Scaffold this active site. Sequence first.
Site, PDB file in Angstrom:
ATOM      1  N   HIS A  30       0.905  -1.140   0.000  1.00 52.33           N
ATOM      2  CA  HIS A  30       0.000   0.000   0.000  1.00 52.33           C
ATOM      3  C   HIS A  30       0.949   1.194   0.000  1.00 52.33           C
ATOM      4  O   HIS A  30       1.985   1.157   0.658  1.00 52.33           O
ATOM      5  CB  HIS A  30      -0.868   0.017   1.263  1.00 52.33           C
ATOM      6  N   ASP A  35      -4.129  -3.887  -4.215  1.00 54.76           N
ATOM      7  CA  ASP A  35      -5.569  -3.998  -4.047  1.00 54.76           C
ATOM      8  C   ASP A  35      -6.304  -2.658  -3.994  1.00 54.76           C
ATOM      9  O   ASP A  35      -6.916  -2.308  -2.991  1.00 54.76           O
ATOM     10  CB  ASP A  35      -5.861  -4.809  -2.776  1.00 54.76           C
TER      11      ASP A  35
END
Length: 198
Positions: free
Chosen positions: A121, A159
């Site tokens: 991330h 994601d």
Amino acid sequence: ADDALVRLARERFDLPDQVRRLARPPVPSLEPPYGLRVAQLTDAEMLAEWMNRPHLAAAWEYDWPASRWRQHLNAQLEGTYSLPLIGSWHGTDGGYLELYWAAKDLISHYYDADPYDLGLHAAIADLSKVNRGFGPLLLPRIVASVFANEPRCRRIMFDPDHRNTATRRLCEWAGCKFLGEHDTTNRRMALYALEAPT
């Protein structure tokens, strides 16, 4: 109530022995003028400010008070699952990342994860440098470093929210393997896997 240990929503505990035995993810490295360092509980105030900004509050949804970010940071630092990093250039901090073991994360429920799969991330604090394509430039180096540190890691997982077209297109142009859209605990995401160089 002296900053009690919170539970990371995405952390998975029903782990195989091989996975549970994994130490915290290695700290990647960036050559000067760029630097990466492990976040500190004292970075809480700065991060809370960063994450409460327009672009990050919508993409991370982690727009909490310093106190909370402090808990999020501590929870990660105290385990062997997620590693929070701060990115800098020219003596200034301008980015935050999270390098975590995918097999120890919620996304391992939507695809067959290899034990050494890593997830990443990342966010740029400068609403400015975002529109400049700064991330697309540094990401490749970071990923290379990540792969270098863990020769066993066969892929890095991304994601983004299924609506984050800008990020999804980046994943597509980079050659990531698309693994479908999936409804998760709180949102619907698009899962991508960047296979390690062959």
